[PDB]
Each structure stands twice: as structure tokens, then as C-alpha cells.
């Protein structure tokens, strides 16, 4: 009785879609309350979305309307479960949750009956994963009733919605929104729509969240600095890496998952081309989903890196401002604590440390990316991997030597520019006395000589970057040419179907993009190193003596 | 930045030209993409300019304050007003941070909607490929170029 | 600056730190009535169609399950005679639910499960019909359109009547229907600091409506300027004429209450006048005029105003001058 | 000790030696409406099923009695065609009662007794349907959930305003819906002994609500501290500050009356303050605050209180000192 069980599955989706519409229409016709398992709930709901797409694919392959209707109904049922959970996050209830729990139990029952009747005799996998996902959402609902007040004894002892991000007077809500919105910045809509109607102001934009204030970042940073001292230039670097911590690590994990999916795309291209030469629309739908997912996770990684960077900037700014207090004027008399030097410190180190902390998560994914690239191209090239492998191994050491020759010029560049800035400072605050008896030629020739030395450094850097780009293009093209020529006629005797060719070109382009980037990365990397060395020498100035 | 921009614009030109060559029908689905992207870019432009201007107007006074604290050290440490000045700097740095944060958030939002636009275009490009270049066009080599 | 209650009558003060759990489905039963006739019709047809489709699905399912849906002659009688597909099942559902009863497809006395599904279908249908009738009648009874017609001149004036300073402000009706026992609660708010060092952010105080021997109410047929005279005892008696236009923050609100005739409900109209809204030393133009055989009221001159050569001075200083003259 | 009316607003005094025979089925028709929506739905389905089963039983009985229930072909026509067992009899009962009329089983013009049972079935069904519709609409119209939101600070304070002792107590709204013409009846109870040797166990006396020139009512938008000043004429003027905390038995009740907007019914909120509840010499924290462009009210500081260096003395002795200073 297959159609009978299909109908029995269609029923509960219908029940839920019918109870959702009155409440959804009343709600459609500012305190955010979150429940445990919220993020788990949304993750599982996206996994349900995926498995339902797969079920629709099965129903297309088989066709008999009644045989693929269950997927089309669970689709709207899961979307309406999302709508319910949005309506509950916006206003809490004990009853709407039970309304979800009933549906979960009934859907689990129907899926169990399906599984049994199948066992007695592709569907199996899709159905098994369905049952598992339903079961985990059920456990989440049981956790939610266990927490506060589904039926449990009298009073919830309910949380008292969080005042950290819900406090009156706040515009920015990244931490104060739902699971699905954080990725898209849907909250921004209002704001960007508002900005066009009325120009933006500082009183227009809000305050900063509980976990965003520079006071707490300075607090965390000084605590970590103390813990590091109880255990120099290297110490403060260790403290910075410690302090950002988990957020930074998470940004890296998001980027690595985005990278694996980014490699996954070209494989779908291979499959599509192969079926074109001869299970194809599924390749298009899955490819579209994969590309969307990579984009979402890449942008989230960039955002969290930027968050970590701005918090770094705030914390080190307030740390150096606190330390300027205890600084003694005997240092201020010396060139090391020059006022212009200290303001250059603040501004350019804000800049350099922020840019390095935006580019550091990007490079913490280059190794995993290249490794997965080669482990994917083995299965596509075959015995013709040797050529590409030799190319991407011959790339690395010459690139290391080029990067060394680059860094050496860049550091001297920074020293010369730093002296030029102080010469300009002492030239501009005395232009009156300078033009009075016209000592201009001397100071102008001195600044011209300093500019010529700086230009020598810059031209060395530019020639080295040009050689870098030359290599990063010439080695790739030679690699592609050699590999293909080798496969067709040299040894392999297996005609490369066009799918292999285009998939190789795709993976190869994905590999090429990071190499061009790393050359620019060194420019920010040595600058971050120099900025921290300067910051540590500044922190090592003479204290003021307590009475 | 200039060289990367030139490389990316030439890559975009190449990709559009290739997709147009492989499927002469795609020129029916390109104008809506262009229109929606144009409108969203226009909407982003004014908000972005406003956020950049506010960023600059908050970033100037913080550095003015830093310089003045650095030079007039003796007076500030004589009065023993250090709590007041540290509180002031906390105010200024928090405002600077929120300005920067909103600028980068608007950047991220534009990037996300642009990536959704790119997903749309690649999706229906591949769909029109698998449909037309197989059923009615019956061409094999163009599929790889189009999808790549 | 910030206003206390807006001109349209709605409240401006926004609450913060409210508790939780208010409106446990009863205030939603009334918020449903509140929604506009199109939205309410939409949700009503939505509820009806939802119930109809739910029970049609369950009836198709039960006819499929008994095997009566499998087309066969003999060895059985269908629990619902002459049922073939989902279309006839939905037709049977709408035939038994909304109580038309075509009787082409007959439920039989062979299956008690169909008896149970019918006995729950009918009671749930009757309950939803009863609520959807009571609610539309309740919504129908109100008249908001009749309520929102109260009108008060945009700005109020002050003049000199009977040798004393006085407040003049126009009210009026906009329909034939009267308002019974309309009373005026005229109040003033201000940030006040007591002599005991206590500072209140806003202080409501009753300023009287000056009528005959007594009375807090008035009678509205024609636009009647409400007539109050500020004296040394009045709270508004201390201000100055040159400081009100720009700097000061004084909101004078009027609350006109009254029960409409046809419905009998007690409605009211609240309006505010700021410090920058009110002006000094003027006079309204007479509205009523002796027409052919009646009194003609011209609403074009309702907010019109003429200059009057009246002295400009503070009410405290004016009372001191009255003590001197 | 014993309280007069509880904090929640319910009454505490329990009556004894009441007479008899009150509520002869009419107050039960309204006590039915009073019961909670689940209980009311239960009793409604109970009444419906009771009537349905009663008439199904009587129809099965009459079909059995005529002999038409005995399966036989010819020599008769069943009073109700195509009736076989109790199941089909109950189906006919629910088909004719709730007015669906399937017509598979037909009542015939051979038996007038079936005509009579139908003519009583239909009228009793119509009457029970009419009462069960009117009652659910009547129950639906009320809004108790809207009623129970009145809030008064847990303890009330006294302070020194304008050189005189004053009573300060917070009230407030909890929803967007206003309350029209809310009046305050502030009363005090005490066991009093007259100079004529008469002892009363409890004595209600009106303590005024001090508003503008007159008025027993107020206007509720934001939490407004009700402001009364006890003078030598006030009944509360004689007590002492150190004897109220523990020993004395004084209940100060407030009765806030007012008609809600949407329903038009006149609700009220009554609350008591004992001698041990009220305290001395304090000040509430300002709730309203000038927000971005509005007024923000913080209900966390609603019951918060700050110390004030105010003199502590009895109101009689305070008036004597005012006569001396
Ligand atoms: N001729 C009229 N008939 C009916 N209502 C009017 C008329 N003129 C104005 N109103 C309403 O009553 C109020 C009276 O204000 P009004 O005298 O018109 O001053 P203003 O012209 O500055 O709005 C207005 O808010 C308006 O909505
Ligand atoms: N933030 C609030 N929002 C709404 N109602 C409140 C709030 N706080 C208290 N209430 C209610 O109003 C009354 C005010 O008393 P309250 O100021 O809370 O003193 P206490 O904390 O001792 O109960 C309480 O009985 C409570 O039921």
C-alpha cells in the first residue's frame, strides 16, 4: 500500500499548514527572546530544506502525483515551522511550541511506518536522514519545554529578555537577530531604506552593544597581558592572538568550509558536461545551492574578521592612551616620544593592524585550499598529475625567495618614510621663520633626497612585484599546456573527455587566485610586524614613579 | 588595487561575451539582472558616501584629541584630571568604532546581495545551457566554456 | 522637541520595560475584530477554507483506507456511497460541513468511524460558524468613523475679556449626530521642581473649564469657543508672553469626553497645544451669521483670526497692574 | 491581621446568614457564560450530544415499535424509509437535527407520530441552537483580560510638598487602549468609637483626590502619582509616624473607575494599603525621561525609592509647628 503511506505522510503537513494560517495572518495583519537550540533548529531546518530538494529530485525521476507530494508538503511545512519560530522569537508563548511538538511527533510516526514497510522489501537514504532530522528537532523541542515552561511546574522563571542588545537606544543589531538573518544582514534593510529618506547622523546611529564597548576589550586585553607577563615584543603579539580567540578561529573555520564548497562547484561542472556528452538537472540545482552557500559563508567570514579587527583597534588605542599617562616627560624630550611620532603611531598602526587582521583569516585558509586542490586534481588527471604537481612544487621556493627580497626593501622603505614625516612636521610648524630669510632650498633639497631614497626602496619593491606577477602567470599557463599535451598523445592513450579538461581549468583557476593575493599580503604582513615592534618599543618607555 | 580592478573587469567582459556566444538566448535574461543590480548599486552609493563622510568626521577629532593630550601632558597630569580625559577618549573611540562598523556592515550587505545576483545569473545560464544546447542546439563544446 | 500626545489624538509616550504574557488568546480574539474589513474578510474566508480542506483530506483518506475508494462492485458497501476521487470527496466535505446536504453521496450505517468523523465535523463547524458570526456582528456594532470627527482649531488664542485675560479655543461637531453630556478635562503639563528639591519630568494639573454656576460639561451644537479665565490661583498664571514662542516647553491638552447617540459608547478626543503653537493678542472671526431664516455657520473662517489692539504683558504683571489699576 | 479587600482587587469580607433562593436559572444562564472557554466548550458539546442521543434513542424506539424495524418486504412502508439498526437511526437523528438532510432515509406520510416527533425535534433544536449562539456571542463580547491590567505600586509613600505633608502613590496603564473618564474614590477604614459611646467595627470615609479647581477624575496616559495633601480637616490628619508600622490597623483603599474604549463597559480597580505596608519619608525615582525624540518610561524604577532628609513628626504636631513656624 505505497500510495496509502504516501497519503498518511501528506496528512500531518496539511494539519500544520492549516493551523499556521490563522496565527500567521493575525501576526501579519521590540524585545527579542531566544531559546536554547535556536541555532541548532535553524541549521537542522536548512538540512531539511536540502533533503526535501533531494526528495523532489527522486519524485521527478520516478514519474503519479500522490507519490511525490509528501516532499512538496514537507517543504511548506518546514517553511511554516520557520514562520512559527519567527513568530515565537518575536513574542513568546507556551502554546505555539506545543503546536510545533504535536506535528513533529506525528511526522516521526509516519516516517517510521515508511521505514518499516521499506525494510520488509535511493529512497532508503533520503528517508533515513529524514527520520534522523525529525528526531533531533523533537529532542530540541523537548529541551525547550524542559527549560522554561511548556507544562513544567507553575512559573517559567523566564529569562527577562536580554537588555545587553535590547536596551533602548541601539541601532546596530548583529548579535541581536535570528539565525538565518545574520548571514544576509536582512536587518540592514530598514537602515539603508531610512538613510535615503533622511541623512544620517551620530545621534541617528545607535550606541555600541554590551560586547562591543572598548572598555571591555581593553579589560580583556590587559587581563591577558598580565597573564602573559606572569608566565617584550613577542608577548603582546601572543596576547593579541589569545584575546581575539574563538571569533578569529571561527572566521577561519567558515572560510575553510567555504573553500571546500568552492572546490565542490567545478565537480558539478564535470558531471553536467559528462551527462551532456551522454541525473543532470539535479546537478544544476545542487550547483546553484553550493554556490549560494559558499557566498554566504565567505561573506560571514569577512564580517567576523572585520569585527575582530575593529575590536583590536579599539583595545590597543585605549591601551596606548592609558600608557601615555604614565609616560614621563624625559621621554617626551627625546625623539622616541615625539608628539608627531605618537600620532603617527596611533593612526598608521590602527590602519596596519586592522588591515593585517582582515587579511590573516584569508591566509589561514590558503594551505587547506591548495591541499584540497591537489587531492581533487589527482582523481581528474590520473597519471598526468606529475606535471601539475612539479609545477606547483617548483612555484613555492622561488616565491619564498622573491618574498624575502621584497620584505627587505619594504622595511627600509618604512624607516625612510618615518624620517620624512618628522622632517615635514618640523618644516611646516616653522614656515614663517623659514620663508622669513628664505632657508627653503636647504630643507627642500633634504626632503628631496629623502624622497629619492624612499623612491629607490619603492622601485625595488615594484620591480620585485612585477617579477612576481610574471611568474604567477607564466608558470600556470605552462602547467596547463604541459598537462593536457601529455595526456592526449604523450602517454595516457585515454582520450580526455571535455569534462575533464574544463574541470581541470576550473580547479586550476581556483588555485591560481590565492598566489596573486599572497604577494600583496606580504605588504601588510611586514607592516604589521613593524607596527607591533614600534608599539612594543613605545610600551617599553620609562614609567612615572609612584610616591 | 588598480591592477586587480583592471583584471577583474576584463574577466567579467570575457565571461559575459563567452556566455552570450554559447547561448544567443541569454540576452533575454541579462537586462533584468542589469536593472536590479543597477538599482541596488544606486541605493548603496548614497548610503556608502554618507557612512564614509561620517567616518572621516568622527576620525578627525580623535586624532586631534590624541595630539593635544600628548603635547599638553604636564597640565593634565598636574590637575589630576586623568579620569575625565580617559572617559572622554572612551567616548570618542566608541563613536569611531560604531562609524567604522556601520561602514563595513553596509559593505558586507552589498556584497551579499551581489553574490545572490551572481548565483542567479550562473544558475539560469547553466539551466538554459542544459536545456537549449542539448535539446534544440545539440552542441557539445560550448557547454564547458559556458559553465566554466 | 518632544510632544506629549499628538494632534490626531493618538498617544506619543512610548512604554519601556513592560512585563510579559498579556493577551492569552482573548485579546487576540478582539485584535482580530480590530483589523480592517478587507483583512477581516480575508482571515474569515481563510479559516473557513482551512477547516473545509482539512476535513476533505481526512474523508478522502478514510474512504481510501476502508478500501471503498478502490472501485469495486459487490462484496462491500462504501462507507460513503458513490465516492470516486478526491474531487467528489471535497464535494462531500463541503456538502456535509456547510449543511447543504445534497445526498447524492450517502454515508452508510456500516462504518462507525465515518459516524465519528461526521459527529466531530458538525460540532466544530457549528462552533466556528458561531464565533465567526458573533465576531462580525461585534465588529459591525462599533463606529470609529463616527468617532474621529472631533475638530479643534489648530492654534488657540488668548484675549482680554471683562478686564481679565482669557483663553479662547474652538471646538465643534461635523455630523448631524449629537454627543450626549460632553465634558471637558483641560490639563497642562510641565517639568516642575518642588521647593523640597523634587523634580518631576512632567506634571499634569487641571485647569478649569469656566461654565455657569458649576459643571465640567458643555453642550455642542455649533462651534463654541471654550472660555476660561486665568486668575492668580490658576497654574498657567505665571508665564510670560515673549518667552512662550520659542524656548519654553508647555503642552496644554484638552480631553473632550462624551457618549454618542446611536451607539451609546463613550468616546473622547484629546489634543495638545505646544508653546510654539499658541499665539498672543488676537480674536477669532464670528462664524455664525443670521441667514435667510436660520443660522449659517461658515467653516472657512473657522481658523481665521484678526488683530486686536490689546496690551501685551505677563499675567502676573497684569494682575499687579490690575491691583494698580 | 485581617484585610478589608485584597491586593488583587477581590473582596475579603465573607458574608454570613444570607437568606435563600437566589438565581432561579437566570443567574445560572449567566454563571454559565462566566466559566472558562474550555469548560464552556465542554458544556456546549455536552448539551448538543445529549439532545442528539435522546432523539436518536426515541427514533430507534418508534421505528422498532411500528414494526418497520423488523426487516420485511411488502405489506408495509417504514415510517422512515431505509432504516435498519441503531446506527442508521442515530444517523437519521443527526441528519434531521442539525439540518443537513441527506435524504437517503425518508420519513413518509404514513405515520403521523413520526411527523409529531420531527415537529418537536426541530423546534427544540432551533431553541437550543439560538441560546448556544447568543451565549457564546455574549461571552465573547466581554474582555476581562483587558480589565485586570491596572497596577498600583506595592507600597505608597508620604513626603513634604509645598510645606505640607502629602500622599504619593503611583498608578498606570499597561496597554495602548485608554480608559475614559477614570475617577478616583480614595477611602480609609478604621474601627471608630463616637463620642456618644457608639463603636463602629469599620468606618469608610472619603479622603479627597487633589486635582485642579475640582474634579473627582483624572487622566491616565503615563504613570501619574496621585497627589493628595492631608490638612487639619482630613480624617487621616491625626495619626503618628512611629505607631503605624506595627500596631495600628488602618486600611487605605483606592477605587479607580473608568470605561474602556473598545467595549464601553465601566470597569474599576480596588486596592488596599495596610498600616504595615505604608512607609514614611521617601521619594519615588523619576520614571519619564527625555528620550531621542519622545518620552521613555522605565517600569523597573516604578517601585524604586530614594531616601530624603525630611522631618519625621505627626501631622497634628506638624500643623502645630506650622502654626509656630
Ligand atoms: N472647513 C472645514 N470643515 C471641516 N473641518 C475642517 C475645516 N477646516 C479645517 N478643518 C479641520 O479642523 C481643524 C481646524 O484647523 P484650521 O482652522 O483649519 O487651521 P489650519 O488651516 O492651519 O489647519 C484642522 O485640523 C482641519 O483638519
Ligand atoms: N516592570 C513592570 N511592568 C509592568 N507591571 C509591573 C512591573 N513591575 C511591577 N509590576 C506590577 O505592578 C505592581 C507594582 O509593584 P512593584 O513596584 O513591582 O513593587 P514590588 O517589586 O515589591 O512588587 C506589582 O504588583 C506588579 O504586579
Author numbering:
A (entry chain B): 24 to 52, 63 to 96, 103 to 160, 167 to 276, 283 to 329, 354 to 622
B (entry chain B): 1139 to 1286
C (entry chain A), D (entry chain C): 32 to 356
What does the paper say about this structure?
The third structure is the KATP channel in complex with Mg-ADP, VO43-, PIP2 and NN414, a ligand combination that favors the NBD-dimerized state of SUR1, which is solved to 4.3 Å (abbreviated, Mg-ADP state). We observed similar “T state” and “R state” conformational heterogeneity of the Kir6.2 CTD and SUR1 ABC transporter module as in the ATP + GBM state or the ATP state. Here, we refer to class 1 structure as the “T state” (the tense state) and class 2 as the “R state” (the relaxed state). Similarly to the ATP or ATP + GBM state, the CTD of Kir6.2 in “T state” has a clockwise rotation (~11.8°) relative to that of “R state”. Moreover, the ATP binding sites of Kir6.2 are also occupied by ADP molecules, and the Kir6.2 channel is in the closed conformation, similarly to the ATP + GBM state, which is consistent with the result that ADP can inhibit the KATP channel albeit at a lower affinity. The ADP binding mode at the inhibitory site of Kir6.2 is similar to that of ATP or ATPγS. Because ADP lacks the γ phosphate, there is no direct interaction between ADP and the γ-phosphate-coordinating residue R50. This explains why ADP binds Kir6.2 with a lower affinity and the R50 mutation shifts the IC50 curve to a similar range of ADPβS on wild-type channels. We did not observe any density at the PIP2 binding site, probably due to the low affinity of the 08:0 PI(4,5)P2 to the purified protein and also the negative cooperativity of inhibitory nucleotide binding and PIP2 binding on Kir6.2.
